[PDB]
Amino acid sequence: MTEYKLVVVGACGVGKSALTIQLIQNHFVDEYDPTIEDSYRKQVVIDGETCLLDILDTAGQEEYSAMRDQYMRTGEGFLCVFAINNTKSFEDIHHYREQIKRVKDSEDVPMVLVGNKCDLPSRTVDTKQAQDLARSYGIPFIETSAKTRQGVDDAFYTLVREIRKHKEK
Ligand SMILES: Nc1nc2c(ncn2[C@@H]2O[C@H](COP(=O)(O)OP(=O)(O)O)[C@@H](O)[C@H]2O)c(=O)[nH]1
Ligand SMILES: [Mg+2]
């Protein structure tokens, strides 16, 4: 079956691991070492297609930069995650967007912008500001909560749909 290589990127603390574990295992893990980087797999049906999601939960700097370049080149779509209560993590999206395009040497890379922790009333990034950024990139924007599961399937399944649209060209 088709496998989709997804990569979850974003500043430390935004909820990359929590989102991935919620997607894969259907529970909220509120404490997971920020320095652990690992891949997870799940076989799902998306729009009638039985497929495999092969998801890299990134954790930032690698032993060697070649390891980062390798996962960006092999990755097919990227969840660019910020936390709605951390403005610096939102600003960091500019860096991730650029770095992925730079490594893949492509202006057309499937991505989805994810604003996580939307169960918290505490918010420094309003939806309008995040929509502005996603509009500038021409990518979807989804607010999520790894805690409540809101938006979680939508974020990952939308990324698969973005990969499909890229492939058909
Ligand atoms: N309230 C809330 N907390 C979250 C959410 N996602 C992650 N967290 C918390 O934010 C912190 C960092 O999450 P983690 O998954 O380790 O982020 P990572 O460094 O991006 O992998 C942890 O204390 C989690 O409990 C969420 O959707 N809502
Ligand atoms: Mg993590």
Side-chain angles (χ1 to χ4, degrees), residues 78-93:
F78 300 77
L79 230 43
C80 296
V81 185
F82 70 94
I84 64 162
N85 64 341
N86 193 290
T87 294
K88 178 57 163 55
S89 76
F90 182 70
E91 292 169 344
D92 289 349
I93 297 293

PDB file of all heavy atoms in Angstrom, residues 78-93:
ATOM      1  N   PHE A  78       5.192  18.101   5.409  1.00  0.00           N
ATOM      2  CA  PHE A  78       5.659  18.638   6.682  1.00  0.00           C
ATOM      3  C   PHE A  78       4.538  19.334   7.432  1.00  0.00           C
ATOM      4  O   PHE A  78       3.890  20.236   6.895  1.00  0.00           O
ATOM      5  CB  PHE A  78       6.830  19.592   6.432  1.00  0.00           C
ATOM      6  CG  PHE A  78       7.969  18.904   5.756  1.00  0.00           C
ATOM      7  CD1 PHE A  78       7.920  18.623   4.398  1.00  0.00           C
ATOM      8  CD2 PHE A  78       9.046  18.448   6.488  1.00  0.00           C
ATOM      9  CE1 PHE A  78       8.925  17.916   3.780  1.00  0.00           C
ATOM     10  CE2 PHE A  78      10.070  17.743   5.866  1.00  0.00           C
ATOM     11  CZ  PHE A  78      10.003  17.480   4.511  1.00  0.00           C
ATOM     12  N   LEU A  79       4.316  18.908   8.666  1.00  0.00           N
ATOM     13  CA  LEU A  79       3.455  19.630   9.588  1.00  0.00           C
ATOM     14  C   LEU A  79       4.328  20.653  10.296  1.00  0.00           C
ATOM     15  O   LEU A  79       5.260  20.282  11.020  1.00  0.00           O
ATOM     16  CB  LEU A  79       2.887  18.688  10.639  1.00  0.00           C
ATOM     17  CG  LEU A  79       1.389  18.654  10.935  1.00  0.00           C
ATOM     18  CD1 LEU A  79       0.566  18.687   9.646  1.00  0.00           C
ATOM     19  CD2 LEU A  79       1.062  17.408  11.739  1.00  0.00           C
ATOM     20  N   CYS A  80       4.038  21.929  10.071  1.00  0.00           N
ATOM     21  CA  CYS A  80       4.795  23.019  10.673  1.00  0.00           C
ATOM     22  C   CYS A  80       3.990  23.498  11.872  1.00  0.00           C
ATOM     23  O   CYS A  80       2.967  24.171  11.712  1.00  0.00           O
ATOM     24  CB  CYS A  80       5.005  24.132   9.654  1.00  0.00           C
ATOM     25  SG  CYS A  80       5.994  23.649   8.236  1.00  0.00           S
ATOM     26  N   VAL A  81       4.436  23.129  13.067  1.00  0.00           N
ATOM     27  CA  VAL A  81       3.652  23.279  14.288  1.00  0.00           C
ATOM     28  C   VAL A  81       4.192  24.445  15.107  1.00  0.00           C
ATOM     29  O   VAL A  81       5.400  24.519  15.377  1.00  0.00           O
ATOM     30  CB  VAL A  81       3.666  21.989  15.128  1.00  0.00           C
ATOM     31  CG1 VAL A  81       2.739  22.140  16.322  1.00  0.00           C
ATOM     32  CG2 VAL A  81       3.258  20.770  14.301  1.00  0.00           C
ATOM     33  N   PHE A  82       3.292  25.330  15.529  1.00  0.00           N
ATOM     34  CA  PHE A  82       3.576  26.312  16.567  1.00  0.00           C
ATOM     35  C   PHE A  82       2.530  26.145  17.660  1.00  0.00           C
ATOM     36  O   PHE A  82       1.531  25.448  17.479  1.00  0.00           O
ATOM     37  CB  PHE A  82       3.610  27.745  16.005  1.00  0.00           C
ATOM     38  CG  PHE A  82       2.265  28.267  15.591  1.00  0.00           C
ATOM     39  CD1 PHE A  82       1.495  29.020  16.462  1.00  0.00           C
ATOM     40  CD2 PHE A  82       1.767  27.993  14.327  1.00  0.00           C
ATOM     41  CE1 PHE A  82       0.249  29.483  16.079  1.00  0.00           C
ATOM     42  CE2 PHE A  82       0.516  28.459  13.933  1.00  0.00           C
ATOM     43  CZ  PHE A  82      -0.243  29.207  14.812  1.00  0.00           C
ATOM     44  N   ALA A  83       2.775  26.746  18.816  1.00  0.00           N
ATOM     45  CA  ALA A  83       1.789  26.772  19.887  1.00  0.00           C
ATOM     46  C   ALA A  83       1.137  28.147  19.951  1.00  0.00           C
ATOM     47  O   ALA A  83       1.820  29.173  19.875  1.00  0.00           O
ATOM     48  CB  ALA A  83       2.433  26.433  21.228  1.00  0.00           C
ATOM     49  N   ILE A  84      -0.190  28.166  20.107  1.00  0.00           N
ATOM     50  CA  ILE A  84      -0.928  29.420  20.041  1.00  0.00           C
ATOM     51  C   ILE A  84      -0.592  30.374  21.173  1.00  0.00           C
ATOM     52  O   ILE A  84      -0.960  31.553  21.097  1.00  0.00           O
ATOM     53  CB  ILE A  84      -2.457  29.218  19.980  1.00  0.00           C
ATOM     54  CG1 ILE A  84      -2.970  28.559  21.270  1.00  0.00           C
ATOM     55  CG2 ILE A  84      -2.850  28.427  18.737  1.00  0.00           C
ATOM     56  CD1 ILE A  84      -4.469  28.716  21.488  1.00  0.00           C
ATOM     57  N   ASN A  85       0.078  29.901  22.221  1.00  0.00           N
ATOM     58  CA  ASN A  85       0.486  30.731  23.344  1.00  0.00           C
ATOM     59  C   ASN A  85       1.988  30.984  23.356  1.00  0.00           C
ATOM     60  O   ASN A  85       2.527  31.421  24.379  1.00  0.00           O
ATOM     61  CB  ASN A  85       0.018  30.109  24.660  1.00  0.00           C
ATOM     62  CG  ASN A  85       0.655  28.764  24.930  1.00  0.00           C
ATOM     63  OD1 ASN A  85       1.178  28.109  24.024  1.00  0.00           O
ATOM     64  ND2 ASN A  85       0.607  28.334  26.186  1.00  0.00           N
ATOM     65  N   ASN A  86       2.676  30.735  22.238  1.00  0.00           N
ATOM     66  CA  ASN A  86       4.115  30.962  22.183  1.00  0.00           C
ATOM     67  C   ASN A  86       4.440  31.675  20.872  1.00  0.00           C
ATOM     68  O   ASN A  86       4.581  31.044  19.818  1.00  0.00           O
ATOM     69  CB  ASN A  86       4.894  29.668  22.327  1.00  0.00           C
ATOM     70  CG  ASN A  86       6.353  29.929  22.591  1.00  0.00           C
ATOM     71  OD1 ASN A  86       7.054  30.390  21.710  1.00  0.00           O
ATOM     72  ND2 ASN A  86       6.815  29.659  23.815  1.00  0.00           N
ATOM     73  N   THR A  87       4.587  32.995  20.954  1.00  0.00           N
ATOM     74  CA  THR A  87       4.837  33.798  19.762  1.00  0.00           C
ATOM     75  C   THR A  87       6.156  33.436  19.096  1.00  0.00           C
ATOM     76  O   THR A  87       6.245  33.412  17.866  1.00  0.00           O
ATOM     77  CB  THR A  87       4.785  35.273  20.132  1.00  0.00           C
ATOM     78  OG1 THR A  87       3.447  35.585  20.529  1.00  0.00           O
ATOM     79  CG2 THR A  87       5.190  36.148  18.960  1.00  0.00           C
ATOM     80  N   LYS A  88       7.193  33.167  19.887  1.00  0.00           N
ATOM     81  CA  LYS A  88       8.473  32.783  19.301  1.00  0.00           C
ATOM     82  C   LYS A  88       8.330  31.527  18.446  1.00  0.00           C
ATOM     83  O   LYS A  88       8.927  31.430  17.365  1.00  0.00           O
ATOM     84  CB  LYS A  88       9.512  32.588  20.407  1.00  0.00           C
ATOM     85  CG  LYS A  88      10.888  32.144  19.945  1.00  0.00           C
ATOM     86  CD  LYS A  88      11.507  33.082  18.935  1.00  0.00           C
ATOM     87  CE  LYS A  88      13.019  32.841  18.824  1.00  0.00           C
ATOM     88  NZ  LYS A  88      13.365  31.417  18.509  1.00  0.00           N
ATOM     89  N   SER A  89       7.515  30.557  18.896  1.00  0.00           N
ATOM     90  CA  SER A  89       7.328  29.347  18.097  1.00  0.00           C
ATOM     91  C   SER A  89       6.640  29.657  16.778  1.00  0.00           C
ATOM     92  O   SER A  89       6.930  29.012  15.764  1.00  0.00           O
ATOM     93  CB  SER A  89       6.570  28.261  18.871  1.00  0.00           C
ATOM     94  OG  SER A  89       5.167  28.511  18.972  1.00  0.00           O
ATOM     95  N   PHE A  90       5.739  30.642  16.774  1.00  0.00           N
ATOM     96  CA  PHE A  90       5.123  31.095  15.533  1.00  0.00           C
ATOM     97  C   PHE A  90       6.149  31.766  14.620  1.00  0.00           C
ATOM     98  O   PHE A  90       6.217  31.474  13.421  1.00  0.00           O
ATOM     99  CB  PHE A  90       3.958  32.028  15.867  1.00  0.00           C
ATOM    100  CG  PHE A  90       3.213  32.535  14.672  1.00  0.00           C
ATOM    101  CD1 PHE A  90       2.413  31.701  13.918  1.00  0.00           C
ATOM    102  CD2 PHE A  90       3.335  33.858  14.289  1.00  0.00           C
ATOM    103  CE1 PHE A  90       1.727  32.182  12.817  1.00  0.00           C
ATOM    104  CE2 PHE A  90       2.658  34.349  13.181  1.00  0.00           C
ATOM    105  CZ  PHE A  90       1.843  33.507  12.445  1.00  0.00           C
ATOM    106  N   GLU A  91       6.970  32.661  15.181  1.00  0.00           N
ATOM    107  CA  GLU A  91       8.037  33.289  14.409  1.00  0.00           C
ATOM    108  C   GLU A  91       8.991  32.251  13.836  1.00  0.00           C
ATOM    109  O   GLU A  91       9.490  32.414  12.715  1.00  0.00           O
ATOM    110  CB  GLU A  91       8.776  34.298  15.295  1.00  0.00           C
ATOM    111  CG  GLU A  91       7.924  35.499  15.676  1.00  0.00           C
ATOM    112  CD  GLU A  91       8.539  36.369  16.751  1.00  0.00           C
ATOM    113  OE1 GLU A  91       9.482  35.915  17.430  1.00  0.00           O
ATOM    114  OE2 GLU A  91       8.069  37.514  16.923  1.00  0.00           O
ATOM    115  N   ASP A  92       9.250  31.172  14.586  1.00  0.00           N
ATOM    116  CA  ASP A  92      10.143  30.130  14.090  1.00  0.00           C
ATOM    117  C   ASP A  92       9.606  29.443  12.839  1.00  0.00           C
ATOM    118  O   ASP A  92      10.389  28.819  12.115  1.00  0.00           O
ATOM    119  CB  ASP A  92      10.403  29.062  15.155  1.00  0.00           C
ATOM    120  CG  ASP A  92      11.270  29.545  16.304  1.00  0.00           C
ATOM    121  OD1 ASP A  92      11.874  30.636  16.228  1.00  0.00           O
ATOM    122  OD2 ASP A  92      11.378  28.776  17.282  1.00  0.00           O
ATOM    123  N   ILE A  93       8.297  29.509  12.579  1.00  0.00           N
ATOM    124  CA  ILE A  93       7.750  28.885  11.376  1.00  0.00           C
ATOM    125  C   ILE A  93       8.453  29.416  10.135  1.00  0.00           C
ATOM    126  O   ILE A  93       8.713  28.669   9.184  1.00  0.00           O
ATOM    127  CB  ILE A  93       6.228  29.092  11.295  1.00  0.00           C
ATOM    128  CG1 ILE A  93       5.511  28.406  12.465  1.00  0.00           C
ATOM    129  CG2 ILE A  93       5.709  28.595   9.949  1.00  0.00           C
ATOM    130  CD1 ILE A  93       5.603  26.880  12.429  1.00  0.00           C
TER     131      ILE A  93
END
